From a paper:
Arthrobacter nitroguajacolicus Rü61a 1-H-3-hydroxy-4-oxoquinaldine 2,[name] ([name]) and Pseudomonas putida 33/1 1-H-3-hydroxy-4-oxoquinoline 2,[name] (QDO) were the first dioxygenases discovered to belong to the ABH-fold family. They catalyze the O2-dependent breakdown of N-heteroaromatic quinolone-type substrates with concomitant carbon monoxide production. Atypical for oxygenases, these enzymes promote the activation of the triplet ground-state O2 molecule without the aid of metal centers or external organic co-factors. Kinetic measurements indicate that their reaction mechanism relies on a fast initial step, during which the substrates' 3-hydroxyl group is deprotonated by the His-Asp subset of the triad, thus promoting its activation for molecular oxygen attack (step 1), whilst the nucleophile is not essential.
Numbering used by the authors: 3 to 275
The structure:
Amino acid sequence: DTYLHETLVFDNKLSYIDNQRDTDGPAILLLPGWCHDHRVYKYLIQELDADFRVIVPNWRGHGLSPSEVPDFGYQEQVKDALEILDQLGVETFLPVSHAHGGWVLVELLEQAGPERAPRGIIMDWLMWAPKPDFAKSLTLLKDPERWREGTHGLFDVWLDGHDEKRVRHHLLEEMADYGYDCWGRSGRVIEDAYGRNGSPMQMMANLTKTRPIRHIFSQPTEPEYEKINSDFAEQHPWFSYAKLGGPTHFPAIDVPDRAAVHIREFATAIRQG
Ligand SMILES: Cc1cc(=O)c2ccccc2[nH]1
């Protein structure tokens, strides 16, 4: 893309998107999950490009040229993200995560605090502790013999029986270059994240400074999942959610206009005070 840069972050050379838009705050920080990169956000960036500064960091070993790197977790993702923001001179930002990029977002809210990071948006992030099928998927990702079997089972869950051309292209072309080094790590880090923090809902409730957070999601589609979101929102005045009714796990790809309007609402709320 026209906006892709590379910088040295501590020991590692990381790629990142920066449209270097000169405009009012806040900056929109789009956080990828595990074993994909800024390509997941190409449609969402087009929705936001004109009106906001947009930054998308890629994690260690992530990007157009994936590589083997030493083991790292979401704490390093957070430091890598802040170091890129410091280099760029960004003060105030609205972070937006996909799936297990949420662990990075919630820890980023904690470390950055509510003046720099007054709100956050989490997209399609499993709010409950792993149910058997997802727990099984993580087990296979960590298996050096069965990791691709793991990825195939997740792609099935993510597409949810849809022939969704753009999402299939992301999973089968834009993620094809990621290996056991990434997918194995993703299994290990996510399993440890739930084990250590209990759940995304526990981790958000545990913030020193609670702030406005919206969960926007298309799946899981079952009423039981909507109910845990409604029960959390009813108990926590700062928490909201919207079911986007997109076909796949990837609303940034399949309903980028819908994601964008939630992000614009939060950016507008920050600008008013
Ligand atoms: C791209 C992406 C989405 C996910 O939900 C996920 C789940 C487990 C491991 C890695 C992952 N990576």
